Symmetry: D2
Subunit: 484 residues, 4 copies
Amino acid sequence: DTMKVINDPIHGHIELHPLLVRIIDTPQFQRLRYIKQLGGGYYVFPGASHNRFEHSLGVGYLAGCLVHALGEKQPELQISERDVLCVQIAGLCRNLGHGPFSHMFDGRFIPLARPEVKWTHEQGSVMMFEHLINSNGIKPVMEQYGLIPEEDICFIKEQIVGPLESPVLWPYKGRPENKSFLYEIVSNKRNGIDVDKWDYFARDCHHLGIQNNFDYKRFIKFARVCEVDNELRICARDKEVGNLYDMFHTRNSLHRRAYQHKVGNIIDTMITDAFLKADDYIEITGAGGKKYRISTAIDDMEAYTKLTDNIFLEILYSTDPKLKDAREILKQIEYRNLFKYVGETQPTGQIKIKREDYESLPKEVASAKPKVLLDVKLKAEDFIVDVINMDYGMQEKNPIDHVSFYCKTAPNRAIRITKNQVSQLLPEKFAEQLIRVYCKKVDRKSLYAARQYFVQWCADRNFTKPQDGDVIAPLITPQKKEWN
Amino acid sequence: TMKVINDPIHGHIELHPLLVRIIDTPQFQRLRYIKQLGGGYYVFPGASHNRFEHSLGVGYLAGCLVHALGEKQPELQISERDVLCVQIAGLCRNLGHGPFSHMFDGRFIPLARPEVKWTHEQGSVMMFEHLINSNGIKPVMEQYGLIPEEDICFIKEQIVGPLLWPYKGRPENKSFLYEIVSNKRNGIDVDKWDYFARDCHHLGIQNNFDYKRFIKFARVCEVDNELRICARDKEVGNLYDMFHTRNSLHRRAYQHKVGNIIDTMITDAFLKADDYIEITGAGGKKYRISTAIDDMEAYTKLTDNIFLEILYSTDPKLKDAREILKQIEYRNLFKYVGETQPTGQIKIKREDYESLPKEVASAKPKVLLDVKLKAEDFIVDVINMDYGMQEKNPIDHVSFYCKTAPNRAIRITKNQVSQLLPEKFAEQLIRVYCKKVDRKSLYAARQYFVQWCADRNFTKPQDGDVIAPLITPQKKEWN
Amino acid sequence: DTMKVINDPIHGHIELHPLLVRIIDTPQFQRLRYIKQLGGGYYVFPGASHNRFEHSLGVGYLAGCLVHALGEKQPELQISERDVLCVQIAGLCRNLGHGPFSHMFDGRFIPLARPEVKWTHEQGSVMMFEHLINSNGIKPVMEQYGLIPEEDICFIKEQIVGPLDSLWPYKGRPENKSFLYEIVSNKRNGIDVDKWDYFARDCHHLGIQNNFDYKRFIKFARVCEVDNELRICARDKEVGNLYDMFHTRNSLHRRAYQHKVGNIIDTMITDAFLKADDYIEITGAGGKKYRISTAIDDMEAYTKLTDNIFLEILYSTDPKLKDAREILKQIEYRNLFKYVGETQPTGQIKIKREDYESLPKEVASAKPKVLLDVKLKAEDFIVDVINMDYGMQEKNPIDHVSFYCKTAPNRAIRITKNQVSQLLPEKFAEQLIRVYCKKVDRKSLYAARQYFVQWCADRNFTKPQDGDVIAPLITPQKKEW
Amino acid sequence: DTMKVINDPIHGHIELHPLLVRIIDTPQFQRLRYIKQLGGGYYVFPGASHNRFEHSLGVGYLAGCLVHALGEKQPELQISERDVLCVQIAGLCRNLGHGPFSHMFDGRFIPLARPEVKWTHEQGSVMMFEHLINSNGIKPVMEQYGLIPEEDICFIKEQIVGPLLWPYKGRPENKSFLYEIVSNKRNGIDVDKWDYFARDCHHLGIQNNFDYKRFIKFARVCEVDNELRICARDKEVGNLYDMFHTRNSLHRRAYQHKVGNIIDTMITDAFLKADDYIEITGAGGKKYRISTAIDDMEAYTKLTDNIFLEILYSTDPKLKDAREILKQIEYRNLFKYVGETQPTGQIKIKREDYESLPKEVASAKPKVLLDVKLKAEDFIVDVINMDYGMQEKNPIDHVSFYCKTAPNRAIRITKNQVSQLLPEKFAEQLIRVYCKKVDRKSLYAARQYFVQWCADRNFTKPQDGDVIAPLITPQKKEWN
Ligand SMILES: Nc1ncnc2c1ncn2[C@H]1C[C@H](O)[C@@H](COP(=O)(O)OP(=O)(O)OP(=O)(O)O)O1
Ligand SMILES: Nc1ncnc2c1ncn2[C@H]1C[C@H](O)[C@@H](COP(=O)(O)OP(=O)(O)OP(=O)(O)O)O1
Ligand SMILES: Nc1ccn([C@H]2C[C@H](O)[C@@H](COP(=O)(O)OP(=O)(O)OP(=O)(O)O)O2)c(=O)n1
Ligand SMILES: Nc1ccn([C@H]2C[C@H](O)[C@@H](COP(=O)(O)OP(=O)(O)OP(=O)(O)O)O2)c(=O)n1
Ligand SMILES: [Mg+2]
Ligand SMILES: [Mg+2]
Ligand SMILES: [Mg+2]
Ligand SMILES: [Mg+2]
């Protein structure tokens, strides 16, 4: 019928087009009210109670702001109301595929439960969207507001997941090359600068109790479309380059402080463990009454719709003896009897730890032979090793090398700006790995031992000296001249 | 040792290890799964916050105030033991809240168990007892210099009031300690201060009350042979503003017409599910949503999760309950018809609440109607808005002091402050909703409602002339 | 010439049309950088360093927001770019007439220096605007962007000061654009974008949180026909917020704008200006010399009249300025006139401006009945009478607001107080009386308190809040207390 | 005399001890109400109306917070109320020496007006403090609250300017940590930065990412090389690198804004042209100039941003040139920015060479057709040294940490133990060029000279180089 206004603490009063309201008021979208944006982070930052639902609204809103702003400044782009709605819908719907505890689910649980499968929340989002549309009669409503479901549904999915085919050339079908800039708004595959980041920086910071340094409104004011290699792309004003390096610095800061918090991660790990132990016994009803497991609900969207953080409490409150082991792990979380952090280190020089080797690392730690007197001997199964890849969103690459700029004197001429033209105070590398070790045995003597093994293992592997190495393992650190 | 927690409202808070021990229990962690504002989250999407983090905030502010009093007035002899007891009461005064907070004790329990008298306060005391006993907290209390017999009594009295000087946990010279966490005298306490700041931060409303300022100007003075907390005289304006703010937040957020109808629909689903949901309590015994309040072990497991357990159920017994919740997801809500108030001396009694839908349906609007509506099609919600003490002005129950004589307590009357203040401190709002959502039913509902307002001499609804143009002319008082 | 972007801490990045930039980059506008928004308030709230310049930008921006929003929701109103620019210019320029220390200048100084004259900053703003336009060749630039200077300059002035009887008293725009006159300075009910900026800005600087949400109000605003005029109407639901807006404004006056010490600093600075008025020379048109009190008669001189006057006096060496300089030095040492207390008339007693001067005499004539070391005279007392209201004297401004309902968005309606809440104010205007003593020693102050409380008793004013503590021998005589 | 409560928008309600109130309520301190914290920055960021006065209160407040927090956690340090007051006073008084438009005055004006002299606002602050104490009878009041003026005044001055071997006399080595609070000479981590980050951000419209309250919670005193020093928890090292990143961001965005700087430059020009004619009365009625008021504190007390308006509103023909420059600011007829570049070579451009740079630019021979020829005096070259506060050095190498397992054992943490994503260098220079000739043809020419000069000197390619000087940039293969 008519536009709704929603009060968001980040963005203020947002107007929602009635088509978007229709998309939001569905079981598939409302589901996101029951999935914490930061997963286990809430168990460390008590303000982070926010869910994916409200983040989704924010992304939808910002996507519309950016496309409206481009259209207002450059009418020659011929951006239609139809384009605007499609970009907003993609913004609203790019989080639809998230599972219980967000990144815990696709980062930890699915890889261990279904190692053969290749699943991402992105793929999930496309499938959920299709299901949402078909289950709720949205196509007619789309037609009613001037959308063309065939081409526009394709466009929306492409915005979320990228090209739907191997093209080897313009690989997209939803819109032609003259609207290429529309594909940079919601999920920017070229350099990662998109409205999804802008919402979460502001939102997460507001809830975590950290201040956000990046100003997206400013960026929107200075954004333009220019021709670059026969494509119309979004370009930033030259003097905004510093702000973009700061944007990636901020993202990395938030990962260091919050998203990869050592305890937040171990809680995610413990919850994953409980889910693995419960996977054989929890039943989720999907299409036609078929029963699915936590690990297989991703194969049926009707079942996936019912897969939320609620799983955690269903396990916790269970009485079935089959779920006793799973339930015991979650109860250890409530009593704050968590696996203990032992320490952190990094590979040196060129060493790069491969995903294939992740499983062998607890074995390596337990095989270390620290020359120290020990009351307990520990085994591989007592250790957890968490490898975390930190980067600027593009592996080893500098994402600012993939950004186009324009100058005040020639607003339609796109240019490139190299790192050396900006500052010598910027990073020389754009990717690194952190290795965290934890012990499942929490008593004082086990922990003392775990520390000796860990520091010995660092020495053996030529990893960096842990920050507290000399205090936790004073008998081990002297053997390594490189550390002294 | 002490833990540091980052709260977005208060910054980095330090927690004494005894408090950490209380927090890391199933009974306290439970509060992570109970939304502070209940159905409000379905209207204000930023209001995802739960009772857990509000509890931390209250505990922190309680310690701030008692610490500030001790530092300014060492002659009060506030001990570390006193400080911990006040902080614990602050942490634990929300323990008794049920699913969707005020929905549970404001709507559900009254309907499910009309004979019983339950408040979240009473719940908090029982939960606290259970928390202490289940988790071996008494020894830990002793280890930090608390005396469990007296101090547990003190903590409970702080939460629920008296279980002559009616308190046993502390003597009259420490009377001021009973004003911090839950202030029975005038409602000015640290619980409000946290929720103002917290709710505002998440709702997207800006808070006008400055509790840090109030703490800077607070003192203890002798008042009628009690040592009480007194405010500086010139802070009287800020206190009237505090109650104005609280009332604003109720108008805007806590009593939002749609937030309330969602709470009402969820309550309805819970009533229809109550016979079939089983919650396991002590010794494996089974309880219902409505009886879990009788066993704390069962109550520990009663959270907002009930909503999803119903929503995801496949049992045909829960089909009716499940349908109501599904209507929430599709946003097929009962429809708001309008709002009015009693005039003059009229006051609607709780005993009459159930007869009101019947009255509305009995109205005889002189208008042509496609459909005829029945009592069961109407919901009438009566909301009592006040400054926390019925008809009374809470500032008449506040003691002040002046800069020239800091130890001399005084009273300040409304007329000494401003003539721009309220003349009344309590009112009732009546909201009417229709369970029949189609265009023709709604049109009819509006005619009944406005006719009923006219019959009862209630105030003219704001949109009365637009929704019922044929009805409003009959009432000269309305024009 | 292209748009400039400016970063404001209240509003974020604001775009300024090149015509507005041209208006801003003039001596007449830049002048506002040297005039504190809150005057003597900075001497109490150290965060209130803000000046009228940045408040002006904010008002200009919000004016454009509201008119853009109305045009976007209701294209049938035919709001032109020309209309938008005129409203933004009026927003930018409505503070041009402010003098040194803002409300100190027209609230205290001019009334005492030039009692015969009737001056308001509004009138000042119109005159300054005219001077700004003419001095800087702005008329051609206006033409270049599609404005018609004759009509549009008239429109801008009318927005600031009102009509320069009749059904339609305005010449700048016809009745079908009536709603444009409600944006910058709303004469009908006071709800305008000037308040919205200062609520947000003052709060941000004072360290008080603002509770009024103007972005919400903009979303719900519409134009409807009311008594053959097109007016801005608010959604019915929003009536509570509007009462809260006036409550907030009153709160900010109580806490900040009428702070007892902020006011006494304003008073002392005014006193210094009065004692310096004969000796400070301000050069105006054709080299003529003016005084602080007469610079309002020449805009070229007025352009040079800012808070700088304070420091010119303070740093002076001329013995002529010794008395003025001494008062300002007392401010630096914080040897301020002392606050004695506050009271109010009872019920419907009202004090009038003609009587203000006789009040120090009345206080000094009181005969307390208490042992006193010192006897005080009329010249030792300052009596400050402050009229607090909701912007329209005794009237409820919400009775002058039009609303619409969700079921009929084009039908305007009225909402009375009783349809909203019984918890709202029963009166919308009141007076506060503050007494101060110029003699600051302990004994004088003790005495001043006895006179004050006795005078309250004699006049049947309300009992001061600390009356029983400051004058325990006086308050018992009054049973009503 | 009792405590006063003051409402600050950054810190909330702050309590001020009556001795501090006495120090504040003096002409020498109140002066700071008339000196903008960010100088010409207000002419670019309209929210930056804030003055040094309120920043000084903030620093005083934060200094007391930190010293109280250390005393509360570690009573064995024997921190006295006397220590607390001395640290708070130093915090309040470290900005006393600032001149008109803050860093414009000692960064630009004094170096040009008095090239022979070596003046810093720090030195100014000690001299102003001495003058404040003596002029206002503060010593007796200090005694009244248990201070010992001889040793405590020395302590306060040392906190501000450093030593006037354990080089300090105000306090012994067992109180070394007290010297790290207000102006930290060792690594730059002090409460002054914490206030200005929060305050500047609040006013500029930029969000601050550094959390000082958190840092205070984790701070401890430990023994390091026979000194008791403030140590940070090991975990917090990342936050400290972020602190310096933030400081550098604020310099890039705000403090060194290209237009903010050129306004500072133009105001400095006006002051130089007015210096012979403005008279400031100092001790015994002696007259001083803007450039010599630093030699008499009584005169310096009267030297504030007011000078700007005194010049602007002047009618004296002697001040006509100075007044014209300021009027160009009001009309926004500013010197024009031409561009920015950096050295590639490791030697920093030296301060001794700064003056020769406009000559070099004008001597460039761009191979381009030009309507106008420009001269050295038409160019301004601004050299800006950006660093993490310690020249080429990493300040985090000068920080001591402790671990949770051994709180009393101080340790060091090297860059490689933290991250590979951190800077490899900690100092750099930016070179900005501006033209005093503002017309279209002059500016076109200025751009050709500038880019040619960058090419000749092997500086980095300006960001818009290809657009502003398309005929010049091809000659340089390193840029292509
Ligand atoms: N860098 C940071 N900035 C802001 N908040 C943080 C940061 N790191 C953690 N927090 C939050 C999360 C918690 O609520 C609180 C305490 O976290 P943290 O200091 O890491 O405790 P911890 O228990 O993990 O460390 P430890 O046990 O090693 O002392 O602060
Ligand atoms: N109601 C208020 N809310 C917030 N800040 C306030 C309020 N009233 C005053 N302030 C500010 C102004 C000052 O920065 C600070 C102290 O002012 P205030 O409490 O009025 O002291 P005062 O010196 O005027 O009163 P007194 O000397 O009578 O105690 O608080
Ligand atoms: N005083 C208020 C009231 C509401 N909101 C927020 C809460 C909602 O997220 C959003 C829209 O709520 P409304 O009450 O304005 O809209 P409704 O749909 O309830 O009213 P209606 O449908 O009658 O327009 O605004 C707010 O910020 N301040
Ligand atoms: N990193 C920055 C730079 C500027 N600003 C603010 C300060 C100004 O008030 C406004 C405009 O600054 P710009 O530097 O963008 O404008 P200029 O005129 O300096 O740039 P140009 O003329 O080259 O567009 O934005 C900001 O918030 N952050
Ligand atoms: Mg609605
Ligand atoms: Mg810990
Ligand atoms: Mg510019
Ligand atoms: Mg005072």
